[PDB]
Every structure is written in structure tokens, then in C-alpha cells.
Write an enzyme that holds these catalytic residues in place. Structure first.
Site, PDB file in Angstrom:
ATOM      1  N   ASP A 461      35.869  44.667  27.930  1.00 31.87           N
ATOM      2  CA  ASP A 461      35.480  44.559  29.443  1.00 31.87           C
ATOM      3  C   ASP A 461      34.116  45.342  29.916  1.00 31.87           C
ATOM      4  OD1 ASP A 461      36.526  43.815  32.181  1.00 31.87           O
ATOM      5  OD2 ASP A 461      36.204  46.118  32.894  1.00 31.87           O
ATOM      6  N   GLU A 498      31.833  41.384  27.593  1.00 36.51           N
ATOM      7  CA  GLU A 498      31.235  40.994  28.490  1.00 36.51           C
ATOM      8  C   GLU A 498      29.743  41.710  28.486  1.00 36.51           C
ATOM      9  OE1 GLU A 498      33.864  42.117  31.755  1.00 36.51           O
ATOM     10  OE2 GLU A 498      33.406  40.052  32.609  1.00 36.51           O
TER      11      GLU A 498
HETATM   12  O1  LIG Z   1      43.747  55.337  47.030  1.00 37.47           O
HETATM   13  C1  LIG Z   1      42.801  54.379  47.370  1.00 37.47           C
HETATM   14  C2  LIG Z   1      43.242  52.898  46.611  1.00 37.47           C
HETATM   15  O2  LIG Z   1      43.610  53.121  45.420  1.00 37.47           O
HETATM   16  C3  LIG Z   1      43.666  51.827  44.967  1.00 37.47           C
HETATM   17  O3  LIG Z   1      42.543  50.960  44.829  1.00 37.47           O
HETATM   18  C4  LIG Z   1      41.327  51.254  44.658  1.00 37.47           C
HETATM   19  C5  LIG Z   1      41.095  51.603  43.125  1.00 37.47           C
HETATM   20  O4  LIG Z   1      42.060  52.767  42.518  1.00 37.47           O
HETATM   21  C6  LIG Z   1      39.915  52.102  42.545  1.00 37.47           C
HETATM   22  O5  LIG Z   1      39.563  51.935  41.418  1.00 37.47           O
HETATM   23  C7  LIG Z   1      38.887  50.922  43.249  1.00 37.47           C
HETATM   24  S1  LIG Z   1      38.606  49.466  42.380  1.00 37.47           S
HETATM   25  C8  LIG Z   1      37.404  48.578  43.535  1.00 37.47           C
HETATM   26  C9  LIG Z   1      37.465  47.209  43.173  1.00 37.47           C
HETATM   27  O6  LIG Z   1      38.684  46.646  43.251  1.00 37.47           O
HETATM   28  C10 LIG Z   1      38.718  45.175  43.111  1.00 37.47           C
HETATM   29  O7  LIG Z   1      38.053  44.761  41.821  1.00 37.47           O
HETATM   30  C11 LIG Z   1      38.915  44.001  40.926  1.00 37.47           C
HETATM   31  C12 LIG Z   1      38.437  42.540  40.781  1.00 37.47           C
HETATM   32  O8  LIG Z   1      38.460  41.937  41.912  1.00 37.47           O
HETATM   33  C13 LIG Z   1      39.244  41.872  39.633  1.00 37.47           C
HETATM   34  O9  LIG Z   1      38.575  40.666  39.419  1.00 37.47           O
HETATM   35  C14 LIG Z   1      38.902  42.807  38.452  1.00 37.47           C
HETATM   36  O10 LIG Z   1      37.786  42.739  38.115  1.00 37.47           O
HETATM   37  C15 LIG Z   1      37.403  42.808  36.700  1.00 37.47           C
HETATM   38  C16 LIG Z   1      37.334  41.388  35.655  1.00 37.47           C
HETATM   39  O11 LIG Z   1      38.492  40.912  35.886  1.00 37.47           O
HETATM   40  C17 LIG Z   1      36.886  41.794  34.364  1.00 37.47           C
HETATM   41  O12 LIG Z   1      36.892  40.831  33.485  1.00 37.47           O
HETATM   42  C18 LIG Z   1      35.449  42.261  34.529  1.00 37.47           C
HETATM   43  O13 LIG Z   1      34.539  41.300  34.902  1.00 37.47           O
HETATM   44  O14 LIG Z   1      35.346  43.472  35.294  1.00 37.47           O
HETATM   45  C19 LIG Z   1      36.218  43.483  36.308  1.00 37.47           C
HETATM   46  C20 LIG Z   1      36.359  45.419  36.389  1.00 37.47           C
HETATM   47  O15 LIG Z   1      36.902  45.864  35.327  1.00 37.47           O
HETATM   48  O16 LIG Z   1      39.524  44.250  38.613  1.00 37.47           O
HETATM   49  C21 LIG Z   1      38.819  44.755  39.411  1.00 37.47           C
HETATM   50  C22 LIG Z   1      39.507  46.344  39.538  1.00 37.47           C
HETATM   51  O17 LIG Z   1      40.831  46.021  39.581  1.00 37.47           O
HETATM   52  C23 LIG Z   1      38.086  44.747  44.360  1.00 37.47           C
HETATM   53  O18 LIG Z   1      38.097  43.209  44.246  1.00 37.47           O
HETATM   54  C24 LIG Z   1      36.710  45.093  44.386  1.00 37.47           C
HETATM   55  O19 LIG Z   1      36.034  44.289  45.433  1.00 37.47           O
HETATM   56  C25 LIG Z   1      36.520  46.504  44.129  1.00 37.47           C
HETATM   57  O20 LIG Z   1      35.157  46.719  44.098  1.00 37.47           O
HETATM   58  C26 LIG Z   1      34.215  46.751  45.107  1.00 37.47           C
HETATM   59  O21 LIG Z   1      34.500  47.600  46.182  1.00 37.47           O
HETATM   60  C27 LIG Z   1      34.582  49.234  45.431  1.00 37.47           C
HETATM   61  C28 LIG Z   1      34.424  49.839  46.829  1.00 37.47           C
HETATM   62  O22 LIG Z   1      36.211  50.127  46.929  1.00 37.47           O
HETATM   63  C29 LIG Z   1      32.948  49.208  45.089  1.00 37.47           C
HETATM   64  O23 LIG Z   1      33.048  50.583  44.458  1.00 37.47           O
HETATM   65  C30 LIG Z   1      32.613  48.295  43.943  1.00 37.47           C
HETATM   66  O24 LIG Z   1      31.204  48.467  43.353  1.00 37.47           O
HETATM   67  C31 LIG Z   1      32.806  46.834  44.527  1.00 37.47           C
HETATM   68  O25 LIG Z   1      32.345  45.964  43.781  1.00 37.47           O
HETATM   69  O26 LIG Z   1      39.024  50.969  44.495  1.00 37.47           O
HETATM   70  C32 LIG Z   1      40.162  50.418  45.156  1.00 37.47           C
HETATM   71  C33 LIG Z   1      40.230  50.490  46.778  1.00 37.47           C
HETATM   72  O27 LIG Z   1      39.883  51.505  47.375  1.00 37.47           O
HETATM   73  C34 LIG Z   1      44.835  51.025  45.505  1.00 37.47           C
HETATM   74  O28 LIG Z   1      45.415  49.588  45.076  1.00 37.47           O
HETATM   75  C35 LIG Z   1      44.850  51.266  46.950  1.00 37.47           C
HETATM   76  O29 LIG Z   1      46.058  50.434  47.709  1.00 37.47           O
HETATM   77  C36 LIG Z   1      44.566  52.244  47.679  1.00 37.47           C
HETATM   78  O30 LIG Z   1      44.304  52.377  48.941  1.00 37.47           O
HETATM   79  O1  LIG Z   2      33.417  44.292  39.839  1.00 36.33           O
HETATM   80  C1  LIG Z   2      34.120  43.434  41.149  1.00 36.33           C
HETATM   81  C2  LIG Z   2      34.157  41.955  40.635  1.00 36.33           C
HETATM   82  O2  LIG Z   2      34.932  41.698  39.630  1.00 36.33           O
HETATM   83  C3  LIG Z   2      34.884  40.384  39.178  1.00 36.33           C
HETATM   84  O3  LIG Z   2      33.622  39.760  38.894  1.00 36.33           O
HETATM   85  C4  LIG Z   2      33.329  39.339  37.828  1.00 36.33           C
HETATM   86  C5  LIG Z   2      32.985  37.916  37.705  1.00 36.33           C
HETATM   87  O4  LIG Z   2      34.269  37.138  38.013  1.00 36.33           O
HETATM   88  C6  LIG Z   2      32.525  37.651  36.289  1.00 36.33           C
HETATM   89  O5  LIG Z   2      32.238  35.987  36.083  1.00 36.33           O
HETATM   90  C7  LIG Z   2      31.148  38.312  35.876  1.00 36.33           C
HETATM   91  O6  LIG Z   2      30.304  37.764  36.575  1.00 36.33           O
HETATM   92  C8  LIG Z   2      29.028  37.790  35.597  1.00 36.33           C
HETATM   93  C9  LIG Z   2      28.811  36.380  35.657  1.00 36.33           C
HETATM   94  O7  LIG Z   2      30.004  35.736  34.982  1.00 36.33           O
HETATM   95  C10 LIG Z   2      27.607  35.995  34.975  1.00 36.33           C
HETATM   96  O8  LIG Z   2      27.235  34.888  34.657  1.00 36.33           O
HETATM   97  C11 LIG Z   2      26.348  36.691  35.759  1.00 36.33           C
HETATM   98  O9  LIG Z   2      26.103  36.131  36.887  1.00 36.33           O
HETATM   99  C12 LIG Z   2      24.909  36.315  37.624  1.00 36.33           C
HETATM  100  C13 LIG Z   2      24.015  35.175  37.087  1.00 36.33           C
HETATM  101  O10 LIG Z   2      23.728  35.377  35.655  1.00 36.33           O
HETATM  102  C14 LIG Z   2      22.493  35.081  37.633  1.00 36.33           C
HETATM  103  O11 LIG Z   2      21.796  33.930  37.029  1.00 36.33           O
HETATM  104  C15 LIG Z   2      22.736  35.176  39.157  1.00 36.33           C
HETATM  105  O12 LIG Z   2      23.091  33.692  39.334  1.00 36.33           O
HETATM  106  O13 LIG Z   2      23.765  36.062  39.595  1.00 36.33           O
HETATM  107  C16 LIG Z   2      24.755  35.944  39.222  1.00 36.33           C
HETATM  108  C17 LIG Z   2      25.779  37.095  39.946  1.00 36.33           C
HETATM  109  O14 LIG Z   2      25.088  38.387  39.850  1.00 36.33           O
HETATM  110  O15 LIG Z   2      26.468  38.169  35.760  1.00 36.33           O
HETATM  111  C18 LIG Z   2      27.852  38.611  36.564  1.00 36.33           C
HETATM  112  C19 LIG Z   2      27.945  40.068  36.506  1.00 36.33           C
HETATM  113  O16 LIG Z   2      26.901  40.402  37.395  1.00 36.33           O
HETATM  114  O17 LIG Z   2      31.640  39.539  35.796  1.00 36.33           O
HETATM  115  C20 LIG Z   2      31.810  40.083  37.375  1.00 36.33           C
HETATM  116  C21 LIG Z   2      31.999  41.699  37.202  1.00 36.33           C
HETATM  117  O18 LIG Z   2      30.859  42.682  37.003  1.00 36.33           O
HETATM  118  C22 LIG Z   2      35.617  39.496  40.395  1.00 36.33           C
HETATM  119  O19 LIG Z   2      35.723  38.035  40.391  1.00 36.33           O
HETATM  120  C23 LIG Z   2      35.057  39.880  41.834  1.00 36.33           C
HETATM  121  O20 LIG Z   2      35.675  39.137  42.924  1.00 36.33           O
HETATM  122  C24 LIG Z   2      34.916  41.249  42.151  1.00 36.33           C
HETATM  123  O21 LIG Z   2      34.126  41.489  43.083  1.00 36.33           O
END
Ligand SMILES: OC[C@H]1O[C@H](O[C@H]2[C@H](O)[C@@H](O)[C@@H](SC[C@H]3O[C@H](O[C@H]4[C@H](O)[C@@H](O)[C@@H](O[C@H]5[C@H](O)[C@@H](O)[C@@H](O)O[C@@H]5CO)O[C@@H]4CO)[C@H](O)[C@@H](O)[C@@H]3O[C@H]3O[C@H](CO)[C@@H](O)[C@H](O)[C@H]3O)O[C@@H]2CO)[C@H](O)[C@@H](O)[C@@H]1O
Ligand SMILES: OC[C@H]1O[C@H](O[C@H]2[C@H](O)[C@@H](O)[C@@H](O[C@H]3[C@H](O)[C@@H](O)[C@@H](O[C@H]4[C@H](O)[C@@H](O)[C@@H](O)O[C@@H]4CO)O[C@@H]3CO)O[C@@H]2CO)[C@H](O)[C@@H](O)[C@@H]1O
Ligand SMILES: [Ca+2]
Ligand SMILES: [Cl-]
Length: 872
Positions: A461, A498
Site C-alpha cells: 500500500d 502502489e
Molecule cells: O477518533 C477519531 C476517529 O478515528 C477514526 O477515523 C479516523 C482514523 O482513525 C484516522 O486514521 C484517519 S483515516 C482518514 C481517511 O479515512 C478515509 O480513507 C480511507 C479511504 O477512503 C479508503 O479508500 C482506503 O484508502 C486506501 C486505499 O484502499 C489503498 O489502496 C491505498 O490507495 O491507500 C489508501 C490508504 O491506505 O483507506 C483509507 C483509510 O481507511 C477517508 O475516506 C479519507 O477521506 C480520510 O483521509 C482524508 O482526510 C484526512 C483528515 O481526516 C486527511 O488526513 C487525509 O489526508 C485525507 O485524504 O481519520 C479518520 C477520521 O478522523 C474513526 O473511524 C472515527 O469514527 C473517529 O471519529
Molecule cells: O487516501 C485517501 C483516498 O484513498 C483512496 O484513493 C486512492 C485511489 O482510489 C487510487 O486509485 C490511487 O489513486 C492514484 C491513481 O490511481 C493514479 O492513477 C494517480 O492518479 C492521478 C493521475 O496519475 C494524474 O494524471 C492526475 O489525473 O490526477 C490523478 C489523481 O491525483 O495517482 C493517484 C494517487 O495520487 O490511490 C489513492 C490514494 O492515494 C480513495 O479512493 C479515496 O476516496 C480517498 O480519498
């Protein structure tokens, strides 16, 4: 008094701080063990004060290499009079007024990098505990009998070289414990007594509340025949033979009625060999699937391990709501923080199986059942990949059950900005793998899963947030494991991740990170987003209606304005170039005749954003995909982007085209669980917290989960207007017949991949010599890719014979909604026949595919992939 931290203590004798020349003439370092300092004119309440002489030479190369982002900072020499070990346990500031705290990782590594034992070590007559906590003022261990009982005894640990240790009798085995760590927490500007689990834990009570002092080598933790598992593991001759199926452990069995009620949703479900789910996996394995990638299965937050706290929607009631209603998602969201469901990307402790997936979260079940799961999958011919999440932590700071690493050594395991605030770009609480003991913990944890659980590979990841040096040190350590020494053949352990490059790690700002471009030439795979976006259209963060090669761009416009006809034709041809680079292993150096007619290397074809489409040195560096747990399922993306008037039958052919482009690609094909059975999430783009309702995986094949309500508002509400009419339209929903037909065609395309070594060439040189595309240039036939793969033929060939059955294979991917006839005079007068799998296909249409020798004409029906072979 709550200072920020704009200065860095980088080595025993150097501090870095970005101040001016004049200011640098009056810099001092101040310490207070009791954290009793305040502003007066100056700082007051300090135990000690020492002047820091400006080091005119600046920061040395080792420092600027390790911390590139502060390379311009002024350097200050710490006198030899300072007791650094003592000072790093104190509240510290530097001042010239301008006052700020110190970021300590550099000096902590410089002085206390440690390679000796950590965690619990068992011997015949003793148990010892070791904790790295060089900034702590004190560490003791609290023992409990049982997961719920009162403290029985507290024992003091003694520090040597940053590491706290104590040795006790063997009878300490199977106690529960926590560490009591007295340590300065910058976020509170106080020395706090923190109660923390062991970073090196191997088991836990429910929710990680206490650490279980288990001997991971105990015989009672081994399934029957566990030590013989290496001999039973599926053969893997080459990484080039890998195909990956990505599956969530709860999705697998939550709905599976053939699994006992009490055993649905967790590790035990995999022990039911005759279940619908396991029979499905066996069917795929028999067809040729090699690896199953399981979503996060270590100790993560967001699901309670205590099952009596789990909440559930009324599934019967929700089934009565309209297919485009917002009521289902409202009901799911109302209890989404208290249900059994999360993807699990919220790390707490990496080295322990998730308790919610075990039958009993206290005691040994989580260990034995995880092992039983690995063994069960291996016994149906599948190797097991773990989704490892080393790039961030669920929580930080001194408080709460979900913070462990940052409780113990605050501000070290987590990456911080130049003001000292924790970086959150990877969700929250980004880790700092650039720091020595973080890198150590990552590698140690990988080796734990490889050796203690016999895990066969790892998906990283947000690998772009991990240092390349960590990735490579891990790769070497894993691949050097042997059956004789460790019980596993490490040479067969495969790594991929990734490689996204963004936020604070971009431009190598924290060091050389694990980005796509940086991992070229490492033999570690990365997800090919270029082929994904070219096939599907647009990008997961762009306009959902943007079409691609396999969703009707130019050929079948969907009514969303995408330019004039010439513009869309050209955009289609451009996507075709990108797909063909991907089909040939996404190599930097592979030469394609591009849509303009100009020959271009993969690296010379650029993303709509400037970087090379083809970036790898080897096909094993390419994970080709069109779908994954993130973003829309394959079925959903096709249902969104194609013209609304297409029948579901037509869309099912389009699904097959996409998964077949993966299955017949050079490199490593990656399939989302459900690709093969038309899986839907009712268009949920991010179903991580959307419950079993939106994530249903139905191995009865009666439903695909299309039309079960608008998906949760948080991630989807902006797109509800496009989703609603589609979800409500009965013509969009497949029946059992379509689902079973999708599975049959998926099985057959896997059989085809594994029928010829030509689909799985092992090196870039082989691909460049053997793989040719035949429908290219400005006058190409839109909507068709023709891919030929050559083997040795005639007497005296200039290549090895790889295939004893076929001397040549030609694949035609036809996304047009009509038959095409592709004349390839280069392939005239040859012995091509339709692949025997397709001659015998349950799909009547593909059987009509034909070759005419005089012209080299390949006739291929609409929306069909046809594979032609030349027999030997
Ligand atoms: O006590 C407070 C609070 O705790 C809990 O929730 C907290 C949590 O503990 C904290 O760690 C953060 S997580 C913040 C983040 O959560 C969600 O993101 C998830 C994605 O939606 C999901 O798709 C997946 O993403 C991964 C993906 O599958 C993987 O393939 C790879 O691409 O990477 C990804 C991450 O590894 O998992 C994510 C995490 O579970 C949410 O959708 C995001 O919007 C959110 O992040 C954004 O917002 C935060 C601010 O909160 C920023 O810091 C980020 O930069 C933004 O991108 O925060 C949680 C909420 O505070 C408990 O669940 C909750 O109930 C409690 O109140
Ligand atoms: O961390 C919170 C978020 O987590 C989840 O987001 C994921 C995406 O679902 C994944 O697809 C991936 O995103 C990549 C993407 O796949 C990759 O192609 C690239 O996208 C760029 C692109 O190259 C560029 O040309 C331009 O178009 O903008 C795109 C977006 O910036 O890079 C992406 C990552 O920066 O990984 C992310 C996590 O980092 C979840 O779906 C979200 O809901 C959540 O917010
Ligand atoms: Ca949940
Ligand atoms: Cl409605």
C-alpha cells in the site's frame, strides 16, 4: 508553553535550523527534564543552557542525503560537554526572540540505531522483553493474568544504549502485558506516563488492549502438518507465471450460506473446502490463477474485535427499498462505525492477525486460524499475498487504544513537516521509513509474516511513501529465506505495490521513494494505471462519463461531449498506443508504431501529464489491471461510461474484453475479486466503510449487487444524478445466466493464458524480439488491437523454442460493435486456427472467428477477443 519544532537534531554533534547569519550568532540549546520551561528576553525554567557555535561548513553529506528537504539549513555544533543521551529525554528548545523545539530522529538514529533483539525472546528457563525507547525517562512492564483481569505485578526495565530490557522466568509465558513508558510528548509539552502495547507483538487481546506474551514457535499454535507446508506449496517456476486475485476476507464469506453461521466473515471460512466460496477459488485455481491477495489482515482499527458490539442493518427491510433510493445507504451509514466491516487500511500493530477475523480474539485462535487459512489456500493451488500498510498509522500521540508506536517514541515513527506537525498525505500519521528503526520494523514484520505464517508475497500500500532503500533491503532479506533454515523458499516470494508519487515524498524530497519511476529495474511490481485508464476512460478522479478504448470512445459515443469526431478518433488511437505498451509489459524500451506512424519507445509515449507511459525494465515490474478494491468495480465503470442504450448482454461482452486484455497481457495480470462474476457495488467509488450491503460477493451467482440503492453519500453524492437512472433501469441488471456465462469466459481466458508460455515471456529482450502489434498508425482500424507473439519456427531459428505446441499466437481484441476483418499480409500462408478453448467455447459468437490463409485475414465478431494459434 507549546513550541513548534523547526530545528532538527541530526547527529550527536549537529543541530540544523533555518535562521539567518546574524541570528546564528546567538543560538542556545535549553533542556528541562520535568518539561518546566517557559518564556520570560529569554527562556526560563531550564535545567541547563549551552551555546551552539555556528558550523560554517554547514550540514555534512550523510545528513543532506538522509534529509534532502533540509539540506540548505544552517548547522550548529553541539559541544562535547553535552550529555546527549540525557538531553534527548528532556523537553528541549533552541532559541536566539525565536524559540522552537527539536526534531530528534537524526540524532536518535546516529546514537541509538539498534540491531539486537526486540520484543519477547524465549529460552528454556526465561522470557526477556526488549523495547527501543531512547527518549523515555522510564519503562516498566505491567503484567495481567488474562485479557480482563487486574494488574498482578509491575517490573522495572533497565536501559542500555536506548533499549529497555528485563528478563524473567519461563512462567511469564502466556501472561498479558503493557509497557508503562514515561516520555516527553511534544503535542502536550509534558512528560506523560503512557500505557502501550509492544511494537513487536505477536498476539493481542481483543482490540489490542493488552499484548499476549505468546511463544510464536509453540507447537500447539501449528495446524496439522504445518512444518510440511513448504512441500505442499503450489509450484512457482517464475514470477512471470503469476496471476493475482484481490479479495477481502469478510467479503469472501459474509453472505456464504454454505459456511456455518458462526464461521462467516473471517479466517475460519477458508477451512471449509466444500463451501461455495472455496469451490469458486478452486475453479479459478484449476484454470490457472496462482495468487490470492488478501486485503489488510493484521491488527487494524475501525472494527471492534468484540463481536457482541457488532451492529447490522435489517437486510430484509433494505431489500424492499427502490433500487435508486438513498434509504439503503442512510441505514448502512447510520451504523457504519459499529458494524463488522472495514477494508482495514488503519494500522495499529503490523505483526498480529486481526482479532475480528478470529473465532476468539483472546488467546491463540487468531494465530492458528490465520495459519489454517494460508494452508487451506495453498492446498487448493493458491499462493497467498498480504496487503501490507507500512506508510501510515491509524493514530498517534500519547492517548488511546489505537496509538502504539507514537506513544512510545513520539515524533519518530511518524513523518513530520518542517514545523514539526505530523504529515497526513497517506490518510493520517504518515510513517517515516527513512528512519532506521522504522525501516527495521518494516523488514522485521515482513519476515515475521513470511516465516511465522508462510506468506507467499506482499502488496505494498502506498509504496511511493516508503523509501526505495527499505523496499530493496526487504526484498533481499525475504528472498534469502530458505526451507532448510526458515521453513520457506524465499526465492518465490513476490513483491509489488502502489508506486504513486505525491505530496511530501514527490521529487525525492525525503529520499529516493518507492515511486513507479524509481522502482524501474528493481524487479518489484507496480500497478499500471496507464493501461487501466486507457481501457476504461478518463481517471477515477475525473469526469465519470469520460470514455475509453473499451467503453465506447469515438465508436459508441455516450452523449457526454468529448470533442469533435476527429478529436475522439485520435484520443481513441492514443489510448490504443498506451494499452499496447501495457500489453507488451509496460516497458521503457519497447518500440511501437504509434498512432501518428512514428516509432516510439514506451517511455516516449507520455501520459496526459508528461511522464513515460512505459516505465519498467522487465515485465515482472508491471501489474496490469482495470479494476481493484479502490474505485468503481469493472462492471460498474462499464455501466457508467458506455451508452445507456446498450443491453446488459452487450456490457457483459465488454467486461470480458477488459479482463481478457489483462489475462493475455505480458507482465502480471491482476483481477479484482468479482471481475469474473460481474460484481457491482451499486456504483460505490470507495466502499471501504460501506458495509456488507454494498460489498456483497454472491457465490450463489443469483445476484451481482447492482441496484441495491444509491451508494453512500460521503464519497458518491455528487454523482448520484448519473447513478440513479442507471440503478433504476431493469435492463442494466444481469441475471444468473449472465453471471455464470461471465465466469465461464473468465475461466477460459485463464486457460488460454496458461496454454502457451508465449503469453508470459520472462524478459524485456524476449518481448522486444517476439511481440508485434499489427493495427497501427494514422490509418489504423479504430477499435481493434492485433497482437502477435512469435516462437522459434523453420529450420535454424534465431530464438529459443518456448512452446512445444504452437509456433505463433495472434490475439485480436475487437471492441467494435460489429465484425471486423483484419488483413495482416505478414501472417498470410500460415497455419493459424482458432484456439481449441475457443473452438469449444460456451460462447457461440467467438466460435465464428476465422483465418484465411491467402490474405492473412482474421475475421472477428463484434465485442470479442479471438485467439489464433499456429500448431507445430
Ligand atoms: O477518533 C477519531 C476517529 O478515528 C477514526 O477515523 C479516523 C482514523 O482513525 C484516522 O486514521 C484517519 S483515516 C482518514 C481517511 O479515512 C478515509 O480513507 C480511507 C479511504 O477512503 C479508503 O479508500 C482506503 O484508502 C486506501 C486505499 O484502499 C489503498 O489502496 C491505498 O490507495 O491507500 C489508501 C490508504 O491506505 O483507506 C483509507 C483509510 O481507511 C477517508 O475516506 C479519507 O477521506 C480520510 O483521509 C482524508 O482526510 C484526512 C483528515 O481526516 C486527511 O488526513 C487525509 O489526508 C485525507 O485524504 O481519520 C479518520 C477520521 O478522523 C474513526 O473511524 C472515527 O469514527 C473517529 O471519529
Ligand atoms: O487516501 C485517501 C483516498 O484513498 C483512496 O484513493 C486512492 C485511489 O482510489 C487510487 O486509485 C490511487 O489513486 C492514484 C491513481 O490511481 C493514479 O492513477 C494517480 O492518479 C492521478 C493521475 O496519475 C494524474 O494524471 C492526475 O489525473 O490526477 C490523478 C489523481 O491525483 O495517482 C493517484 C494517487 O495520487 O490511490 C489513492 C490514494 O492515494 C480513495 O479512493 C479515496 O476516496 C480517498 O480519498
Ligand atoms: Ca465499518
Ligand atoms: Cl426512489
Amino acid at each position: 508553553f507549546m513550541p513548534d519544532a523547526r530545528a532538527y537534531w541530526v547527529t550527536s554533534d549537529l543541530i540544523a535550523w533555518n535562521v539567518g547569519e546574524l541570528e546564528a550568532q546567538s543560538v542556545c540549546l535549553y533542556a528541562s527534564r520535568a518539561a518546566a520551561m517557559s518564556l520570560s528576553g529569554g527562556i526560563q525554567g531550564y535545567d541547563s543552557k549551552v551555546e551552539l557555535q555556528p558550523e560554517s561548513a554547514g550540514l555534512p553529506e550523510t545528513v543532506t542525503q538522509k534529509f534532502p528537504f533540509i539540506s540548505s539549513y544552517r548547522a550548529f555544533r553541539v559541544p562535547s560537554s553535552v550529555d546527549v543521551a540525557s538531553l534527548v529525554k528532556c523537553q528541549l528548545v533552541v532559541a536566539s526572540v525565536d524559540v522552537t523545539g527539536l526534531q530528534l530522529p537524526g540524532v536518535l538514529d546516529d546514537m541509538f540505531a539498534y540491531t539486537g533483539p526486540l520484543g519477547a525472546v524465549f529460552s528454556e528457563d526465561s522470557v526477556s522483553l526488549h523495547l527501543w525507547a531512547p527518549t523515555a525517562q522510564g519503562v516498566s512492564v505491567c503484567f495481567f493474568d488474562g485479557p480482563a483481569g487486574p494488574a498482578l505485578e509491575t517490573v522495572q526495565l533497565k536501559e542500555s544504549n536506548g533499549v529497555w530490557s528485563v528478563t524473567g522466568p519461563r512462567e511469564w509465558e502466556n501472561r498479558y502485558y503493557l509497557y508503562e513508558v514515561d516520555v516527553y510528548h511534544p503535542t502536550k509539552a509534558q512528560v506523560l506516563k503512557c500505557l502501550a502495547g509492544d511494537p513487536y507483538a505477536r498476539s493481542l487481546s481483543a482490540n489490542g488492549a493488552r499484548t499476549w506474551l505468546v511463544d510464536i514457535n509453540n507447537e500447539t499454535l501449528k495446524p496439522a502438518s504445518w512444518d510440511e507446508l513448504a512441500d505442499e506449496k503450489p509450484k512457482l517456476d517464475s514470477f512471470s507465471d503469476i496471476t493475482i486475485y484481490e479479495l477481502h476476507i469478510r467479503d469472501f464469506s459474509a453472505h456464504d450460506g454454505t459456511v456455518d453461521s458462526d464461521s462467516r466473515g473471517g479466517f475460519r471460512a477458508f477451512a471449509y473446502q466444500a463451501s461455495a466460496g472455496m469451490e469458486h477459488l478452486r475453479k479459478l485455481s484449476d484454470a490457472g490463477l496462482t495468487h490470492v491477495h488478501l486485503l489488510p489482515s493484521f491488527h487494524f482499527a475501525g472494527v471492534d474485535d468484540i463481536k457482541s458490539n457488532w451492529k447490522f442493518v435489517d437486510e430484509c427491510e433494505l431489500a424492499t427499498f427502490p433500487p435508486g433510493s438513498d434509504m439503503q445507504q442512510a441505514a448502512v451509514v447510520a451504523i457504519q462505525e459499529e458494524d463488522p466491516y472495514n477494508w482495514g487500511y488503519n494500522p495499529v500493530l503490523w505483526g498480529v492477525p486481526k482479532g475480528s477475523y478470529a473465532s476468539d480474539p483472546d488467546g491463540p485462535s487468531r494465530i492458528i486460524e490465520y495459519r489454517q487459512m494460508v494452508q487451506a489456500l495453498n492446498r487448493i493451488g493458491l499462493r497467498v499475498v498480504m496487503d501490507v500498510v507500512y506508510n501510515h498509522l491509524d493514530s498517534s500521540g500519547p492517548c488511546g487504544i489505537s496509538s502504539v508506536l507514537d506513544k512510545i517514541v513520539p515524533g519518530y515513527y511518524v513523518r513530520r513537516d518542517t514545523n514539526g506537525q505530523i504529515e497526513n498525505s497517506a490518510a493520517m500519521n504518515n510513517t517515516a521509513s527513512e528512519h532506521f528503526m522504522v525501516d527495521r520494523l518494516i523488514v522485521d514484520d515482513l519476515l515475521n509474516w513470511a516465516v511465522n505464517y508462510k506468506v507467499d508475497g506482499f502488496r505494498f500500500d502506498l509504496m511511493g511513501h516508503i523509501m526505495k532503500r527499505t523496499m530493496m533491503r526487504a526484498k533481499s532479506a525475504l528472498q534469502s529465506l530458505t526451507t532448510d533454515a526458515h521453513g520457506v523458499d524465499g526465492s518465490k516470494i513476490y513483491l509489488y505495490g502502489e508506486g504513486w508519487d505525491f505530496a511530501e515524498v514527490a521529487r525525492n524530497q525525503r529520499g529516493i521513494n518507492g515511486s513507479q519511476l524509481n522502482m524501474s529495474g528493481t524487479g518489484i511490481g507496480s500497478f499500471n494505471d496507464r493501461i487501466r485508464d486507457a481501457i476504461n476512460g478518463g481517471n477515477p478522479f475525473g469526469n465519470p462519463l469520460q470514455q475509453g478504448f473499451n467503453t465506447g470512445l469515438f465508436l459508441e459515443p455516450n452523449g457526454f461531449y468529448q470533442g469533435n469526431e476527429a478529436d475522439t478518433r485520435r484520443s481513441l488511437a492514443t489510448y490504443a498506443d498506451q494499452i499496447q505498451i501495457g500489453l507488451a509489459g509496460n516497458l521503457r524500451d519497447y518500440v511501437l508504431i504509434s498512432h501518428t506512424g512514428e516509432a516510439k519507445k514506451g517511455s516516449e509515449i507520455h501520459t496526459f501529464d508528461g511522464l513515460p507511459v512505459g516505465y519498467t525494465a522487465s515485465p515482472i515490474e508491471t501489474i496490469n489491471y482495470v479494476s481493484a478494491h479502490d474505485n468503481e468495480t469493472l462492471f460498474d465503470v462499464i455501466s457508467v461510461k458506455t451508452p445507456m442504450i446498450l443491453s446488459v448482454d452487450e456490457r457483459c461482452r465488454i467486461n470480458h474484453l477488459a479482463s481478457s486484455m489483462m489475462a493475455l497481457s505480458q507482465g502480471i495480470p491482476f483481477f479484482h475479486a468479482g471481475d469474473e462474476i460481474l460484481r457491482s457495488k451499486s456504483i460505490d467509488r470507495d466502499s471501504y466503510n460501506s458495509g456488507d450491503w454494498f460489498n456483497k460477493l454472491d457465490f450463489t451467482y443469483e445476484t451481482n449487487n447492482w441496484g441495491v440503492g444509491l451508494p453512500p453519500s460521503e464519497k458518491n453524492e455528487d454523482n448520484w444524478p448519473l447513478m440513479k437512472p442507471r440503478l433504476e433501469n431493469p435492463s442494466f441488471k444481469p441475471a444468473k445466466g449472465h453471471i455464470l456465462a461471465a465466469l465461464d469466459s473468465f475461466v477460459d481466458i485463464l486457460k488460454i493464458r496458461y496454454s502457451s508460455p508465449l503469453f508470459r515471456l520472462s524478459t524485456a529482450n524476449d518481448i522486444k524480439q517476439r511481440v508485434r502489434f499489427h493495427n497501427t498508425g494514422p490509418s489504423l482500424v479504430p477499435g481493434v488491437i492485433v497482437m502477435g507473439i512469435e516462437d522459434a519456427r523453420g529450420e535454424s531459428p534465431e530464438m529459443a523454442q518456448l512452446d512445444t505446441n504452437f509456433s505463433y499466437v495472434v490475439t485480436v481484441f475487437n471492441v467494435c460493435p460489429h465484425e471486423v476483418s483484419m488483413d495482416i499480409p505478414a501472417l498470410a500462408s500460415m497455419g493459424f486456427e482458432l484456439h481449441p478453448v475457443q473452438v469449444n467455447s460456451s460462447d457461440t459468437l467467438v466460435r465464428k472467428s476465422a483465418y484465411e490463409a491467402a490474405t492473412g485475414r482474421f475475421t472477428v465478431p463484434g465485442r470479442t477477443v479471438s485467439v489464433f494459434v499456429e500448431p507445430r
